[PDB]
Symmetry: C2
Subunit: 112 residues, 2 copies
């Protein structure tokens, strides 16, 4: 899923938005477009009378081992978008990120 | 989502919510560490494809365990259902599948 609102709280000259959106949808491209297949077999497994954990694990690992490519590509794009920014815009980015992290930890502790 | 369109006694509704909480228990927490080193990679002046790969995988593991535990519980819930309800679920499943398919050839 897109990082957007990734440039929330950030703006971001208009040519910067041009260069951004072009191509940020290339980051909407090579996102994860699921199969009716993955979904059908997943469904069959989940709906089964007795559960086959090893099967579902197998299917998960396949799916992931797949996505990894996309993951990497979209990471590349993201990095480009990042490089297209000013150290202060960046500052704000890294701040947003760090916030997000803290939130995640708070949630970890609460659910611990 | 997966029950979208099924109901469903209060007793069993609470069973399922109970199971849901205890599931947000048995499942792996978001490894904020890997997230750190990832953001860190993504924001470096020069980009290390292989490094990023290493991290992607290193996270993949938690991703998998999540999928498996989530399926474990979804299946527990399905078990809780009654024959009727399970059939309704099949209805919704097939509808969903239709929409999906009919769309996966659109516009073609
Ligand atoms: Zn089916
Ligand atoms: Zn299903
Ligand atoms: Zn696949
Ligand atoms: Zn906090
Ligand atoms: Zn605990
Ligand atoms: Zn950080
Ligand atoms: Zn990040
Ligand atoms: Zn990991
Ligand atoms: Zn387990």
């Amino acid at each position: 899923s897109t990082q957007s609102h990734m440039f929330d709280g950030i703006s971001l000259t208009e040519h910067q938005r041009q260069q951004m959106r072009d191509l940020m949808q290339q980051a909407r491209h090579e996102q994860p477009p699921v199969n009716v297949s993955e979904l059908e077999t997943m469904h069959r497994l989940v709906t089964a009378e007795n559960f086959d954990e090893n099967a579902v694990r197998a299917q998960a690992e396949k799916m992931a081992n797949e996505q990894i490519a996309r993951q990497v590509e979209m990471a590349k794009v993201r990095n480009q978008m990042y490089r297209l920014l000013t150290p202060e815009q960046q500052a704000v980015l890294n701040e947003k990120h760090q916030q997000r992290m803290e939130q995640l930890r708070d949630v970890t502790q609460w659910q611990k």
